[PDB]
Amino acid sequence: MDVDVSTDGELPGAAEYAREKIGRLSRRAHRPVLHARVRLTRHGDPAVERPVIAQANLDVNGRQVRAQVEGVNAREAVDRLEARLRSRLERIAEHWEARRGGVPAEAGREWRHESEPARRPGYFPRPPEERRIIRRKSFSMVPCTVDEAALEMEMLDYDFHLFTEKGTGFAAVLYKGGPTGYRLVLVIPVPADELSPFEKPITISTHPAPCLTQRDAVERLGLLGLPFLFYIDAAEGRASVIYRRYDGHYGLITP
RNA sequence: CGGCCAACUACGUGCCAGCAGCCGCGGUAAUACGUAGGGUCCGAGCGUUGUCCGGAAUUACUGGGCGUAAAGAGCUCGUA
RNA sequence: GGGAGACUGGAAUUCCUGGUGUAGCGGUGGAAUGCGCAGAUAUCAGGAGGAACACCGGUGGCGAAGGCGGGUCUCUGGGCAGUAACUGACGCUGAGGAGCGAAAGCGUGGGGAGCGAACAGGAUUAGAUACCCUGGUAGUCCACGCCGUAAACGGUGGGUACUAGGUGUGGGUUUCCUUCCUUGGGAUCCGUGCCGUAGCUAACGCAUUAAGUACCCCGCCUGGGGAGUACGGCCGCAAGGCUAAAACUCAAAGGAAUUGACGGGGGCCCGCACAAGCGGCGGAGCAUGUGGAUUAAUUCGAUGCAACGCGAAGAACCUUACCUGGGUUUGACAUGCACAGGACGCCGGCAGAGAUGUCGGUUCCCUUGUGGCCUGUGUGCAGGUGGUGCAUGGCUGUCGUCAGCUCGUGUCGUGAGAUGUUGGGUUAAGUCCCGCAACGAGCGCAACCCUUGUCUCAUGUUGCCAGCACGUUAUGGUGGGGACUCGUGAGAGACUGCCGGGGUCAACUCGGAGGAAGGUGGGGAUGACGUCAAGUCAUCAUGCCCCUUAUGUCCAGGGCUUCACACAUGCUACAAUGGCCGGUACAAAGGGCUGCGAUGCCGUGAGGUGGAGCGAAUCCUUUCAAAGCCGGUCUCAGUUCGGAUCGGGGUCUGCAACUCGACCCCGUGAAGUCGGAGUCGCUAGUAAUCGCAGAUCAGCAACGCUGCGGUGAAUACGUUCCCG
RNA sequence: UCGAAGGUGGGAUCGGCGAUUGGGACGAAGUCGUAACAAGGUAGCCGUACCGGAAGGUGCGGCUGGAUCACCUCC
């Protein structure tokens, strides 16, 4: 490390002492230092109790660390400047050991500015305690085609819709298939040829709607995280679509 | 003879010499250092030191307190 | 869930055994030690063992305190309510004393799954005897005993009586709604919380569970350290515990609360702050400034933002304040008290580097009292870029053109202080609206000013020329003309003015019409209280100190330009989006009298001669530019790039270009191949790039500064990170 | 016989010195580190135990005289 000292007036021996005292702080800086300068001045007025003024500037990897002290002589000023610079460099570290106690920790305990925001679902929580099923629509079970079902979707502003298919005579549910288009799920999977003709670009889910109970359906919805579950009820034997409502209850659509 | 505490100016000196009961005054322009004027309190006396009481409700009988300022035993039983 | 003893239940962790089964498992902010490939992890079945008891489960119960919940049984302590049968003050407290007393720790004997001091490696770090990771011994567990400490806290000793209430919750008795289901409600006794009177307190707060009002008993305190330490003593296997000083030293140590400041605290916002981009710096040569070194001197000031092309808008001499040497002293320059005068003053010669000295010619007008000049003699005195911007004024920077900073009265608090200035919304804004123990006001914001973008009226010279005539190429050049520009006077025009929608029908906000311009249109001038003892005793002034035959003053020469290096600001480049040559088109602004200076002529070119016309909308700076466009050539090379350095020859200014000017001509032809860590500027006529002009100025170090125009981009998803 | 003084002996108790050695108080500027105070960058403190150049670290139990927890949609 190389230091330049720009003294002023009569300060014999201050330059060497300041050089050798400040150059020892290179190991303290955790990043390479560049062009570290020091300046010594003396107050002309004898009325000042601490006439000597010392200033130091270091460029630690682009970060400017500067300090300034007053003293009665060159030696005291240089020593105080060294202590001040050491404290500043300690507060500057920014390496992991010095930035590990401020990084957000745990999952829910403690909150910080950069702590990860809580993931909130669209629905009101309404935990399993008194969740209940307080919405049961049975809008339409008149047979429809894919295009007619899509239009019945669109003006209802509902992502999924349960109807009964024209060609099959079976219950089916359409939903937005994402970027792939739309997706159709039937109680028993059938190919497109048996399905009534359509013009919208859709795809058919190959899996069949399984048979399961109400509590099992709620458990599957909870452990599978889908926006809804379409299934054949075990007791009823017919189609059913459960979705988490906008109040936290489950919306069971039945024929 | 800065304030407690009656009684201010000039010169000499400058973190020196020094003063001081406490707070604190000496860093070329000090009512706090030294000397001169001026002033005030006492007066055959005036100050300093040493000892005791008061102010000290600062051992609180008259006349104190214990959550956080010092102060409730770690908690019960029980002798005088 | 009060305590002790005995028996016993399940989930899960670990290990072992046996199947299926592969190449990873484990761990972190990221990894590595580690485990596994000899079959791990995963999955199933079986077995062994130890510890703790998910849900119930809480500010809910019990206990004097420590503390106490898997289930069942046995033994046992306490409490509450009702009846009030019974005894009849037998009550309260308690020095010493005895007993109980979390965890850790000690002794003997067992047990040991998980966790885990100590101890190993792994990782982070400048260093890690730590935080994080992989293992892991005591210990945690049981039996019998020791110790006797805790933030053993409600930091609140025990008993009693009284002093507004309101509302949760645990236990028990009873009256009335009455279904008599129901926390129905009431009454009452005993607990356990929250809010709140009076009252108390320094305040925070306590407030029928007192820290209120009083009585009885006990313990404890007398400033902070030294110190709960030493000595002595008691207890203990030991660790150590209990009792417990002094010397010396300090003028304080402390409790509560207020205003700031700060935070690797939170929330809401801003800014080229970041993000997306464009161009750079840091690498090279040169210009400039600074540090350091050097020197006789390298005059002085300025040191992050806010010093470092700054004071310096012009250092050869002068400037100049520094050095060497030579002179000078009421002085280089002022004004007053005096003595003598008619000269001071000039002009030539000589000596000297010059200052200066000397020589030669010239000599006052008033008016008799003297005045103007200087001489010397003097005497007050001048004169200091000598010191102190921590004694100052004045001037300036900066936070920051950010939105904030205060005051009057009122109110609250013992007081510092608080409210207003907070809260919701909105804005560029403490801008505004609605609320509100506040009601108002002031400096700040905005507006009033300049410029710019549109139009109308007025307006025609040196400015335009559209329609008319003369023109000679040379063109508004000339007569003429207000028509279009332009010049400069007045005025209009943006005011959420209008419409639609959000909005508390409020501020305000989104969109639309109109208009040249739509929402402070674009840019300026303007910088609140103050901060940083910021800068300036070198623009100036100035208190105090200092010099005064000198730190004043005159002159010559030199220095401020020195250079083994370091930092900063810029310019030119590294080339084909280019170099060179030829042709050719478009600006704005500004300057000019002892200055701009044209035509012509002479030089290759700086330039020389010469002087037309101009104090200038006229003449000159050329009629003005360069980038630009067209044509030719060069062909990816240290080159036809780059220009440094050096040799020779000249011009101009200046008394004088050696130290130390600029420019011109010929030759010479270095580094340099787009530049590490890092870092800067910029949101539109902007960045980038091109040229012109001005101040200072005899000449210039100007590539610097201040303005003017030409051509003119990319990007902004959005506030997580950096700075303020 | 008692009897002062004196002699002998083993102890008590109060002080002084003591080679070496422990800690304490203060000292602008020395050396090594950042422990605490803003969540002080690993919350702090109390009792106890072990370890470490040093502040200190860790294990068990306890206390708050520890900071923050944006947004939060149903109603």
Tokens representing A164 are 């009964």
Q: For residue A97, give the nucleotide whose C1' atom is nearest its CA.
A: C124
Note the CA–C1' distance, A95 to C405, in angstroms. Answer: 42
Q: How many residues does chain A have?
A: 255
Give strand letter and number of the nucleotide nearest A91 (CA to C1').
C264
**Strand D contacting residues by CB (7 Å):** A 21, 24, 72-73, 75-76, 79-80, 82-83, 90-91, 97-102, 109-112, 115, 117-118, 120-126, 246-248
Written as one string, the DSSP assignment of A147-171 is: HHHHHHHHHHT-SEEEEEBTTT-SE
CA distances from A8 to A11, A38, A56, A67, A165 (A): 7, 11, 14, 18, 96
CB atoms near residue A50 (< 10 Å):
14
| CB proximity A100–strand C (7 Å threshold) | yes
Distance CA A68, CA A182 (A): 70
| C1' (C258) to CA (A191) span, angstroms | 81
Decide if A29 contacts A85 (C-beta within 8 A): no
- Pairing type for strands A211-212 and A228-233 reads parallel
